[PDB]
Design a protein around this ligand. Structure first.
Ligand code: NI
Length: 257
């Protein structure tokens, strides 16, 4: 009923999910000249030392690397956030070509891909309750450009053959998400939404300024995945990004000058 095709893509989602035309939809274009430095912002705290990855799943629209979120093992705090947000999963959005694939844009520039580390606010007890709140989620977004390989991505790339098609999963223990982060934690932040149905307006977005580099070969492996299930006609999992939405009555803040 939804996907990224002509007949079921972003331009159709509002029929089932009218919140698609809402007041705080994501992604957005980040106009770097209009974002404003906010001295109120507290420092960003990424505490991933005790992370427990569990599994990788092809869900038909991306692949998710899932974590144990039943304790404070991998948490995000600080920045614009009040309280503690637990890592539940990360995934990527990517293109068919190196010139598109990101959801956020920077001065209209599209990156080859975008990494989303998804966290939920522990005050709400579980993910499902968190997505019903305006401050339920915090998503750390990281752009990917093609150039040098990212060593810490390789273990992800190499399991993708085992989850080619929708509904396939594989064990994926002992993966360290710190190996996917750039050097700087400088960021932009704004209030937004999920970028997939049901498009809930529950996300504090924290988008890092510094991209990571991945190799051609690494992105090419993303592009070998399938949206379809096994035994269905093959449709490459590419261009699984929603385009930028209207900013409306929001101001993007920067953590840096
Ligand atoms: Ni995402």
């Amino acid at each position: 009923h939804w996907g990224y095709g002509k007949h079921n893509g972003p331009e159709h989602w509002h029929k089932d999910f009218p919140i698609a035309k809402g007041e705080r939809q994501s992604p957005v274009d980040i106009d770097t000249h209009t974002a404003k430095y906010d001295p109120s912002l507290k420092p960003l705290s990424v505490s991933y030392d005790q992370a427990t990855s569990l599994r990788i799943l092809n869900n038909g629209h991306a692949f998710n690397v899932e974590f144990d979120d039943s304790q404070d093992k991998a948490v995000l705090k600080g920045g614009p956030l009040d309280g503690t947000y637990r890592l539940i999963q990360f995934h990527f959005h990517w293109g068919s070509l190196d010139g598109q694939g990101s959801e956020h844009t920077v001065d209209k520039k599209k990156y080859a891909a975008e990494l989303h580390l998804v966290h939920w606010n522990t005050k709400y007890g579980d993910f499902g309750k968190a997505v019903q709140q305006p401050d339920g989620l915090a998503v750390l977004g990281i752009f990917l450009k093609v150039g040098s390989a990212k060593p810490g991505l390789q273990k992800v790339v190499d399991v993708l053959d085992s989850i080619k098609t929708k509904g396939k999963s594989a064990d994926f223990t002992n993966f360290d998400p710190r190996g996917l982060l750039p050097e700087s934690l400088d960021y932009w932040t704004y209030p937004g939404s999920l970028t997939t149905p049901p498009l809930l307006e529950c996300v504090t977005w924290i988008v890092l300024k510094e991209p990571i580099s991945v190799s051609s070969e690494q992105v090419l492996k993303f592009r070998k995945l399938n949206f379809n299930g096994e035994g269905e006609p093959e449709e490459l999992m590419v261009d699984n990004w929603r385009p930028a939405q209207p900013l409306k009555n929001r101001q993007i803040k920067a953590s840096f000058k």
